[PDB]
Amino acid sequence: MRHDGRQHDELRPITFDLDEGSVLITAGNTKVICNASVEDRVPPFLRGGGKGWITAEYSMGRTMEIQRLIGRALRAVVDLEKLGERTIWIDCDVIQADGGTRTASITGAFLAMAIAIGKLIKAGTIKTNPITDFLAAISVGIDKEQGILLDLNYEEDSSAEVDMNVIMTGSGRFVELQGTGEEATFSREDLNGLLGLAEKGIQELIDKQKEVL
Amino acid sequence: MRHDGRQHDELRPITFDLDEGSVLITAGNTKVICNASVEDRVPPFLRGGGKGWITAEYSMGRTMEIQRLIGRALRAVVDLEKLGERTIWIDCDVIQADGGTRTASITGAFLAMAIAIGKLIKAGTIKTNPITDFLAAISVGIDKEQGILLDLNYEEDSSAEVDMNVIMTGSGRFVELQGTGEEATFSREDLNGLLGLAEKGIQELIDKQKEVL
């Protein structure tokens, strides 16, 4: 039905290439390189606090928006106190864009962070794992002709009446949610259908994360 | 329970002062002046198209974000073809901020637009009403101690674990939705509770709009 050849609830091929704890994630034609770096400093408003911080650099205005989202989402699944007074720098570089870059950056950014925290734990730098849960993000939408779709590519994102990015944890809770109706609107029923699809795709991404980790 | 004196599902006092089709909306201590202006031109990518446009100026980076949201939300409930080839300029000025400015601007921006379109119809400039439905927006959230709250003031917005802005039409459909978990997360149950409260408040705002109009 989709020009893609995919079913409405089918994810594009996902690849988590770890070949630095650099991560190259591929979703169809979308590709993003994600890197996590640890520094034993923290923003001034935290110095002395004994609690860590996570922040991200992202490249491909609205850029700041995505950098802030990445920092937020990660902080939601990391006990900053257990991390100690140090900050984790995440850096994403979109090398190929074909829809879903923002959510693909989050998924990739998580793994990269997981990899850096693993070395922190193995180095004896921190006593316990601070990651409270797995995290992944996906985009969903409503196309005027094929209905609800999961993981939109460029062309689909472009012509969708309803666009939505969802970030959830492995335990199935929300970290962040955002849906916009173009010159269109969506009902409660549509919202429930969109969140179900999104959850299906996010559970699949997290399954892959666990297995690559 | 709230330092406000309000119940968890109670809106702050709402005022739509029409004393130019200028609108001054007041929500508790939040106050925003909204103005709608009509111009018989349209962005270049539309010239000749015969379809209108709505855009907004907003003042108090993230400013652009709010201006774009205002333009989006309005466009969702207006048949741009019936408006003709002309654009509606909305201008919001936050004169007092105590939480919920962004959603209060949307509600105020809608009325102002409604007022300008009414004159367009009475002037004989357009044959039919282009407004497809009423629209209002409200903020909801989850506070670590009082649970789910409706219409957050500054202090509450500040310490809420979960923040969320919702825009809906009078017919009860979604135009825009955005919820963020700080260093916290919200369940499906939380999401349903948050959307119910939001809908209660939005229905109340729209009731007031209808009666002021």
GROMACS .gro file of C-alpha atoms in nm:
model
  426
    1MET     CA    1   0.000   0.000   0.000
    2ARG     CA    2   0.285   0.239   0.090
    3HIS     CA    3   0.514   0.350  -0.196
    4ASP     CA    4   0.779   0.197   0.032
    5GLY     CA    5   0.646  -0.154  -0.008
    6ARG     CA    6   0.594  -0.169   0.368
    7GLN     CA    7   0.279  -0.253   0.565
    8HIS     CA    8   0.120   0.033   0.763
    9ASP     CA    9   0.261  -0.104   1.091
   10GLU     CA   10   0.603  -0.213   0.961
   11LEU     CA   11   0.933  -0.046   1.057
   12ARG     CA   12   1.199   0.028   0.796
   13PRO     CA   13   1.511  -0.191   0.828
   14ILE     CA   14   1.692  -0.098   1.151
   15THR     CA   15   2.068  -0.123   1.197
   16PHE     CA   16   2.281  -0.044   1.503
   17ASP     CA   17   2.639  -0.046   1.378
   18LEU     CA   18   2.910  -0.022   1.647
   19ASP     CA   19   3.187  -0.028   1.381
   20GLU     CA   20   3.522   0.525   2.044
   21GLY     CA   21   3.186   0.392   2.154
   22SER     CA   22   3.036   0.557   1.846
   23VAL     CA   23   2.699   0.432   1.714
   24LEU     CA   24   2.570   0.447   1.360
   25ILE     CA   25   2.198   0.387   1.342
   26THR     CA   26   2.020   0.324   1.016
   27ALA     CA   27   1.646   0.336   0.957
   28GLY     CA   28   1.573   0.279   0.591
   29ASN     CA   29   1.770   0.560   0.427
   30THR     CA   30   1.797   0.769   0.740
   31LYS     CA   31   2.140   0.743   0.899
   32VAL     CA   32   2.275   0.918   1.207
   33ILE     CA   33   2.610   0.889   1.383
   34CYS     CA   34   2.584   0.919   1.761
   35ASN     CA   35   2.864   0.965   2.011
   36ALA     CA   36   2.868   0.983   2.389
   37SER     CA   37   3.152   1.146   2.582
   38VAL     CA   38   3.200   1.176   2.960
   39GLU     CA   39   3.353   1.477   3.136
   40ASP     CA   40   3.406   1.518   3.509
   41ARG     CA   41   3.256   1.866   3.522
   42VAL     CA   42   2.900   1.995   3.544
   43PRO     CA   43   2.717   2.319   3.461
   44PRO     CA   44   2.777   2.592   3.723
   45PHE     CA   45   2.425   2.571   3.864
   46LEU     CA   46   2.518   2.215   3.971
   47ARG     CA   47   2.882   2.242   4.086
   48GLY     CA   48   2.908   2.080   4.429
   49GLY     CA   49   2.565   1.924   4.399
   50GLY     CA   50   2.703   1.572   4.354
   51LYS     CA   51   2.450   1.512   4.075
   52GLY     CA   52   2.532   1.466   3.706
   53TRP     CA   53   2.397   1.605   3.380
   54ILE     CA   54   2.337   1.500   3.019
   55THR     CA   55   2.348   1.740   2.724
   56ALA     CA   56   2.365   1.700   2.349
   57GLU     CA   57   2.510   1.855   2.037
   58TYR     CA   58   2.311   1.779   1.720
   59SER     CA   59   2.383   1.866   1.357
   60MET     CA   60   2.252   1.788   1.008
   61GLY     CA   61   1.722   2.734   1.529
   62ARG     CA   62   1.506   2.422   1.525
   63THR     CA   63   1.839   2.251   1.583
   64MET     CA   64   1.841   2.382   1.943
   65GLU     CA   65   1.494   2.227   1.983
   66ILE     CA   66   1.621   1.879   1.891
   67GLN     CA   67   1.933   1.914   2.105
   68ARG     CA   68   1.710   2.001   2.401
   69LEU     CA   69   1.477   1.708   2.332
   70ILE     CA   70   1.768   1.465   2.321
   71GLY     CA   71   1.904   1.595   2.651
   72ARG     CA   72   1.555   1.577   2.811
   73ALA     CA   73   1.467   1.227   2.697
   74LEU     CA   74   1.796   1.080   2.818
   75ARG     CA   75   1.779   1.257   3.155
   76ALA     CA   76   1.437   1.098   3.203
   77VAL     CA   77   1.587   0.746   3.220
   78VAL     CA   78   1.907   0.816   3.413
   79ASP     CA   79   1.943   0.859   3.790
   80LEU     CA   80   2.167   1.165   3.774
   81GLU     CA   81   2.269   1.119   4.138
   82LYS     CA   82   2.410   0.772   4.074
   83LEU     CA   83   2.604   0.915   3.781
   84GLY     CA   84   2.801   1.143   4.010
   85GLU     CA   85   2.899   1.503   3.945
   86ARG     CA   86   2.994   1.478   3.578
   87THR     CA   87   2.818   1.537   3.250
   88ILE     CA   88   2.756   1.309   2.952
   89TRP     CA   89   2.798   1.483   2.616
   90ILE     CA   90   2.600   1.334   2.329
   91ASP     CA   91   2.678   1.428   1.973
   92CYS     CA   92   2.460   1.342   1.674
   93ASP     CA   93   2.538   1.402   1.308
   94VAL     CA   94   2.272   1.326   1.052
   95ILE     CA   95   2.462   1.189   0.753
   96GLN     CA   96   2.153   1.091   0.553
   97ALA     CA   97   1.797   1.218   0.589
   98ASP     CA   98   1.487   1.033   0.472
   99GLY     CA   99   1.235   1.091   0.748
  100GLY     CA  100   1.248   1.020   1.120
  101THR     CA  101   1.592   1.171   1.186
  102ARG     CA  102   1.494   1.325   1.518
  103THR     CA  103   1.356   1.006   1.670
  104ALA     CA  104   1.641   0.800   1.515
  105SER     CA  105   1.890   1.035   1.688
  106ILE     CA  106   1.726   0.965   2.023
  107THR     CA  107   1.746   0.588   1.982
  108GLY     CA  108   2.107   0.613   1.865
  109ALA     CA  109   2.191   0.868   2.135
  110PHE     CA  110   2.063   0.624   2.399
  111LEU     CA  111   2.285   0.335   2.291
  112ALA     CA  112   2.590   0.560   2.273
  113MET     CA  113   2.514   0.677   2.627
  114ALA     CA  114   2.463   0.319   2.739
  115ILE     CA  115   2.802   0.231   2.594
  116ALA     CA  116   2.981   0.517   2.772
  117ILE     CA  117   2.809   0.439   3.103
  118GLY     CA  118   2.908   0.075   3.070
  119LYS     CA  119   3.275   0.177   3.057
  120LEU     CA  120   3.218   0.408   3.352
  121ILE     CA  121   3.087   0.109   3.550
  122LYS     CA  122   3.363  -0.126   3.436
  123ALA     CA  123   3.625   0.136   3.512
  124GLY     CA  124   3.502   0.142   3.869
  125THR     CA  125   3.432   0.513   3.826
  126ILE     CA  126   3.073   0.454   3.948
  127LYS     CA  127   2.942   0.182   4.181
  128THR     CA  128   2.604   0.114   4.020
  129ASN     CA  129   2.427   0.135   3.685
  130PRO     CA  130   2.239   0.468   3.668
  131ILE     CA  131   2.023   0.378   3.367
  132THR     CA  132   1.674   0.324   3.507
  133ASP     CA  133   1.531   0.180   3.182
  134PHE     CA  134   1.566   0.139   2.805
  135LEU     CA  135   1.444   0.421   2.581
  136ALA     CA  136   1.356   0.458   2.215
  137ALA     CA  137   1.159   0.699   1.998
  138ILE     CA  138   0.958   0.665   1.679
  139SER     CA  139   0.739   0.878   1.452
  140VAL     CA  140   0.379   0.798   1.352
  141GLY     CA  141   0.124   0.978   1.143
  142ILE     CA  142  -0.193   0.988   0.945
  143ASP     CA  143  -0.181   1.005   0.569
  144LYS     CA  144  -0.490   1.125   0.387
  145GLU     CA  145  -0.503   0.803   0.184
  146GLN     CA  146  -0.333   0.511   0.365
  147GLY     CA  147  -0.445   0.599   0.715
  148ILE     CA  148  -0.218   0.557   1.014
  149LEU     CA  149   0.146   0.489   0.941
  150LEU     CA  150   0.443   0.381   1.150
  151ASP     CA  151   0.794   0.523   1.099
  152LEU     CA  152   0.744   0.780   0.821
  153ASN     CA  153   1.004   0.834   0.549
  154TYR     CA  154   1.065   1.180   0.401
  155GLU     CA  155   0.798   1.163   0.132
  156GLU     CA  156   0.539   1.031   0.382
  157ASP     CA  157   0.629   1.276   0.656
  158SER     CA  158   0.596   1.551   0.398
  159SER     CA  159   0.239   1.469   0.294
  160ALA     CA  160   0.100   1.347   0.628
  161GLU     CA  161  -0.197   1.537   0.770
  162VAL     CA  162  -0.099   1.435   1.120
  163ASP     CA  163   0.259   1.407   1.242
  164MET     CA  164   0.368   1.268   1.577
  165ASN     CA  165   0.689   1.185   1.762
  166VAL     CA  166   0.677   0.952   2.061
  167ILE     CA  167   0.941   0.862   2.318
  168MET     CA  168   0.879   0.575   2.558
  169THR     CA  169   1.073   0.363   2.805
  170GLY     CA  170   1.122  -0.013   2.792
  171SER     CA  171   0.867  -0.044   3.072
  172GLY     CA  172   0.614   0.125   2.843
  173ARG     CA  173   0.585   0.472   3.001
  174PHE     CA  174   0.596   0.806   2.820
  175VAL     CA  175   0.898   1.034   2.826
  176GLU     CA  176   0.777   1.271   2.557
  177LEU     CA  177   0.487   1.307   2.319
  178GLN     CA  178   0.413   1.548   2.034
  179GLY     CA  179   0.151   1.537   1.762
  180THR     CA  180   0.057   1.808   1.515
  181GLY     CA  181  -0.238   1.830   1.281
  182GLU     CA  182  -0.147   2.030   0.967
  183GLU     CA  183  -0.463   2.189   0.831
  184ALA     CA  184  -0.625   1.872   0.967
  185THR     CA  185  -0.727   1.738   1.307
  186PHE     CA  186  -0.731   1.399   1.476
  187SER     CA  187  -0.985   1.237   1.703
  188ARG     CA  188  -0.942   1.052   2.030
  189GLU     CA  189  -0.969   0.727   1.832
  190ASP     CA  190  -0.692   0.843   1.600
  191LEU     CA  191  -0.476   0.928   1.900
  192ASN     CA  192  -0.524   0.581   2.047
  193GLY     CA  193  -0.439   0.417   1.716
  194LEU     CA  194  -0.130   0.634   1.676
  195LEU     CA  195   0.000   0.555   2.025
  196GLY     CA  196  -0.054   0.181   1.972
  197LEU     CA  197   0.147   0.175   1.648
  198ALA     CA  198   0.418   0.389   1.809
  199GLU     CA  199   0.438   0.151   2.103
  200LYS     CA  200   0.471  -0.147   1.865
  201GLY     CA  201   0.767   0.016   1.690
  202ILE     CA  202   0.930   0.137   2.010
  203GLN     CA  203   0.913  -0.210   2.168
  204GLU     CA  204   1.085  -0.341   1.857
  205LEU     CA  205   1.364  -0.084   1.875
  206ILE     CA  206   1.423  -0.153   2.241
  207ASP     CA  207   1.435  -0.528   2.171
  208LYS     CA  208   1.715  -0.456   1.921
  209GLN     CA  209   1.895  -0.232   2.173
  210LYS     CA  210   1.894  -0.505   2.438
  211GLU     CA  211   2.030  -0.755   2.191
  212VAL     CA  212   2.305  -0.527   2.058
  213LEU     CA  213   2.400  -0.431   2.415
  214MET     CA  214  -0.480   2.162   4.816
  215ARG     CA  215  -0.310   2.391   4.560
  216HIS     CA  216  -0.132   2.700   4.699
  217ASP     CA  217  -0.374   2.876   4.463
  218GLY     CA  218  -0.679   2.776   4.662
  219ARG     CA  219  -0.812   2.600   4.353
  220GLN     CA  220  -0.930   2.240   4.312
  221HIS     CA  221  -0.712   2.014   4.093
  222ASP     CA  222  -0.962   2.039   3.804
  223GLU     CA  223  -1.051   2.408   3.843
  224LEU     CA  224  -0.954   2.680   3.593
  225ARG     CA  225  -0.822   3.017   3.709
  226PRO     CA  226  -1.065   3.306   3.653
  227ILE     CA  227  -1.100   3.363   3.276
  228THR     CA  228  -1.173   3.701   3.120
  229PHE     CA  229  -1.217   3.795   2.754
  230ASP     CA  230  -1.210   4.174   2.746
  231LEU     CA  231  -1.299   4.336   2.411
  232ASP     CA  232  -1.242   4.687   2.556
  233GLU     CA  233  -0.970   4.758   1.673
  234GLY     CA  234  -1.102   4.409   1.732
  235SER     CA  235  -0.832   4.368   1.998
  236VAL     CA  236  -0.877   4.100   2.267
  237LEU     CA  237  -0.735   4.099   2.617
  238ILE     CA  238  -0.753   3.758   2.775
  239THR     CA  239  -0.688   3.703   3.144
  240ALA     CA  240  -0.625   3.372   3.315
  241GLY     CA  241  -0.551   3.430   3.681
  242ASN     CA  242  -0.250   3.661   3.664
  243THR     CA  243  -0.159   3.573   3.308
  244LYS     CA  244  -0.266   3.843   3.063
  245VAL     CA  245  -0.215   3.859   2.688
  246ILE     CA  246  -0.330   4.114   2.433
  247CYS     CA  247  -0.425   3.960   2.098
  248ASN     CA  248  -0.489   4.137   1.770
  249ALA     CA  249  -0.597   4.012   1.430
  250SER     CA  250  -0.533   4.207   1.110
  251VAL     CA  251  -0.634   4.123   0.751
  252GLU     CA  252  -0.422   4.196   0.443
  253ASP     CA  253  -0.511   4.118   0.083
  254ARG     CA  254  -0.176   3.961   0.003
  255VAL     CA  255  -0.031   3.615   0.058
  256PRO     CA  256   0.317   3.461   0.081
  257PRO     CA  257   0.482   3.419  -0.262
  258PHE     CA  258   0.446   3.040  -0.263
  259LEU     CA  259   0.068   3.103  -0.267
  260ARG     CA  260   0.023   3.405  -0.497
  261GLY     CA  261  -0.244   3.319  -0.752
  262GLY     CA  262  -0.351   3.011  -0.560
  263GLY     CA  263  -0.679   3.168  -0.446
  264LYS     CA  264  -0.621   3.027  -0.096
  265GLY     CA  265  -0.549   3.231   0.218
  266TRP     CA  266  -0.299   3.211   0.501
  267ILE     CA  267  -0.273   3.281   0.875
  268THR     CA  268   0.049   3.384   1.049
  269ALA     CA  269   0.134   3.529   1.387
  270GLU     CA  270   0.370   3.766   1.562
  271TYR     CA  271   0.421   3.689   1.932
  272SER     CA  272   0.616   3.879   2.198
  273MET     CA  273   0.670   3.876   2.574
  274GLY     CA  274   1.433   3.170   1.970
  275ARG     CA  275   1.160   2.979   2.150
  276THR     CA  276   0.951   3.277   2.048
  277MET     CA  277   0.955   3.152   1.686
  278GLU     CA  278   0.826   2.818   1.818
  279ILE     CA  279   0.518   2.980   1.975
  280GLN     CA  280   0.453   3.199   1.672
  281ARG     CA  281   0.456   2.886   1.455
  282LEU     CA  282   0.224   2.700   1.693
  283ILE     CA  283  -0.025   2.985   1.689
  284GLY     CA  284  -0.024   2.996   1.309
  285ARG     CA  285  -0.064   2.615   1.290
  286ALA     CA  286  -0.348   2.582   1.539
  287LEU     CA  287  -0.554   2.854   1.374
  288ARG     CA  288  -0.498   2.718   1.023
  289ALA     CA  289  -0.633   2.385   1.147
  290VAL     CA  290  -0.983   2.532   1.202
  291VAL     CA  291  -1.009   2.765   0.903
  292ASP     CA  292  -1.097   2.669   0.545
  293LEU     CA  293  -0.823   2.875   0.380
  294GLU     CA  294  -0.996   2.848   0.042
  295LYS     CA  295  -1.312   3.014   0.170
  296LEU     CA  296  -1.098   3.291   0.315
  297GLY     CA  297  -0.977   3.391  -0.030
  298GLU     CA  298  -0.625   3.494  -0.128
  299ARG     CA  299  -0.536   3.708   0.173
  300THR     CA  300  -0.357   3.653   0.500
  301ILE     CA  301  -0.467   3.703   0.860
  302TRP     CA  302  -0.196   3.852   1.083
  303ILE     CA  303  -0.224   3.768   1.451
  304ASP     CA  304  -0.024   3.960   1.707
  305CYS     CA  305   0.012   3.859   2.072
  306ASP     CA  306   0.183   4.055   2.347
  307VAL     CA  307   0.220   3.895   2.687
  308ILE     CA  308   0.173   4.180   2.934
  309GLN     CA  309   0.174   3.961   3.245
  310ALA     CA  310   0.313   3.610   3.288
  311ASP     CA  311   0.205   3.365   3.557
  312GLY     CA  312   0.190   3.032   3.377
  313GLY     CA  313  -0.001   2.920   3.070
  314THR     CA  314   0.089   3.215   2.846
  315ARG     CA  315   0.132   3.005   2.534
  316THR     CA  316  -0.206   2.835   2.555
  317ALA     CA  317  -0.373   3.162   2.667
  318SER     CA  318  -0.231   3.329   2.353
  319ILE     CA  319  -0.393   3.063   2.135
  320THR     CA  320  -0.735   3.108   2.294
  321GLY     CA  321  -0.705   3.487   2.269
  322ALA     CA  322  -0.563   3.465   1.916
  323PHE     CA  323  -0.868   3.263   1.809
  324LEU     CA  324  -1.123   3.518   1.930
  325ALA     CA  325  -0.931   3.804   1.768
  326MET     CA  326  -0.932   3.608   1.442
  327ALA     CA  327  -1.301   3.533   1.482
  328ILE     CA  328  -1.366   3.905   1.527
  329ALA     CA  329  -1.171   4.002   1.214
  330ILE     CA  330  -1.339   3.730   1.006
  331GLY     CA  331  -1.679   3.847   1.126
  332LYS     CA  332  -1.611   4.193   0.982
  333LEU     CA  333  -1.487   4.031   0.662
  334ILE     CA  334  -1.821   3.850   0.633
  335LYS     CA  335  -2.029   4.156   0.722
  336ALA     CA  336  -1.830   4.368   0.479
  337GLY     CA  337  -1.932   4.131   0.204
  338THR     CA  338  -1.563   4.067   0.138
  339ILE     CA  339  -1.627   3.690   0.169
  340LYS     CA  340  -1.949   3.497   0.101
  341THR     CA  341  -1.929   3.236   0.378
  342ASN     CA  342  -1.784   3.183   0.723
  343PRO     CA  343  -1.449   3.001   0.687
  344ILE     CA  344  -1.415   2.904   1.054
  345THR     CA  345  -1.482   2.530   1.065
  346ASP     CA  346  -1.497   2.511   1.447
  347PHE     CA  347  -1.414   2.673   1.782
  348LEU     CA  348  -1.064   2.627   1.923
  349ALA     CA  349  -0.901   2.667   2.262
  350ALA     CA  350  -0.585   2.548   2.436
  351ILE     CA  351  -0.495   2.468   2.794
  352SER     CA  352  -0.200   2.333   2.995
  353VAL     CA  353  -0.211   2.032   3.229
  354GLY     CA  354   0.050   1.857   3.436
  355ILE     CA  355   0.153   1.626   3.711
  356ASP     CA  356   0.292   1.765   4.033
  357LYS     CA  357   0.492   1.533   4.254
  358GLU     CA  358   0.257   1.601   4.546
  359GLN     CA  359  -0.092   1.707   4.430
  360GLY     CA  360  -0.115   1.480   4.129
  361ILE     CA  361  -0.273   1.593   3.805
  362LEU     CA  362  -0.345   1.962   3.772
  363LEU     CA  363  -0.541   2.174   3.527
  364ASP     CA  364  -0.421   2.516   3.407
  365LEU     CA  365  -0.084   2.555   3.582
  366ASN     CA  366   0.034   2.891   3.716
  367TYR     CA  367   0.403   2.987   3.708
  368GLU     CA  368   0.499   2.828   4.040
  369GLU     CA  369   0.315   2.504   3.950
  370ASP     CA  370   0.447   2.487   3.596
  371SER     CA  371   0.794   2.536   3.740
  372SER     CA  372   0.782   2.238   3.978
  373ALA     CA  373   0.569   1.997   3.771
  374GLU     CA  374   0.726   1.664   3.679
  375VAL     CA  375   0.506   1.641   3.374
  376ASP     CA  376   0.408   1.936   3.158
  377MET     CA  377   0.158   1.930   2.874
  378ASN     CA  378  -0.009   2.170   2.634
  379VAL     CA  379  -0.327   2.065   2.453
  380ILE     CA  380  -0.519   2.229   2.170
  381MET     CA  381  -0.863   2.098   2.077
  382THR     CA  382  -1.161   2.203   1.869
  383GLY     CA  383  -1.513   2.265   1.991
  384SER     CA  384  -1.614   1.932   1.840
  385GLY     CA  385  -1.357   1.766   2.067
  386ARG     CA  386  -1.081   1.674   1.820
  387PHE     CA  387  -0.708   1.735   1.862
  388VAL     CA  388  -0.522   2.009   1.680
  389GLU     CA  389  -0.199   1.980   1.875
  390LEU     CA  390  -0.061   1.787   2.169
  391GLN     CA  391   0.266   1.807   2.362
  392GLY     CA  392   0.368   1.653   2.692
  393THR     CA  393   0.713   1.640   2.847
  394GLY     CA  394   0.837   1.442   3.144
  395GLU     CA  395   1.120   1.628   3.322
  396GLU     CA  396   1.342   1.372   3.492
  397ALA     CA  397   1.013   1.184   3.534
  398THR     CA  398   0.783   0.977   3.314
  399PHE     CA  399   0.410   0.926   3.281
  400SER     CA  400   0.205   0.616   3.222
  401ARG     CA  401  -0.081   0.551   2.982
  402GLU     CA  402  -0.319   0.604   3.276
  403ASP     CA  403  -0.157   0.939   3.349
  404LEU     CA  404  -0.195   1.038   2.985
  405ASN     CA  405  -0.566   0.953   2.989
  406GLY     CA  406  -0.618   1.151   3.309
  407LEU     CA  407  -0.427   1.448   3.168
  408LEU     CA  408  -0.629   1.454   2.844
  409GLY     CA  409  -0.958   1.433   3.036
  410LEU     CA  410  -0.874   1.733   3.257
  411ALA     CA  411  -0.750   1.926   2.953
  412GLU     CA  412  -1.072   1.852   2.768
  413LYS     CA  413  -1.277   1.974   3.068
  414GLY     CA  414  -1.091   2.307   3.069
  415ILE     CA  415  -1.098   2.347   2.693
  416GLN     CA  416  -1.474   2.288   2.677
  417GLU     CA  417  -1.509   2.560   2.939
  418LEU     CA  418  -1.298   2.807   2.743
  419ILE     CA  419  -1.489   2.740   2.424
  420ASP     CA  420  -1.820   2.788   2.610
  421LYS     CA  421  -1.694   3.134   2.713
  422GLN     CA  422  -1.583   3.210   2.355
  423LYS     CA  423  -1.926   3.127   2.215
  424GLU     CA  424  -2.091   3.348   2.472
  425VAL     CA  425  -1.857   3.644   2.421
  426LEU     CA  426  -1.893   3.608   2.043
   0.00000   0.00000   0.00000
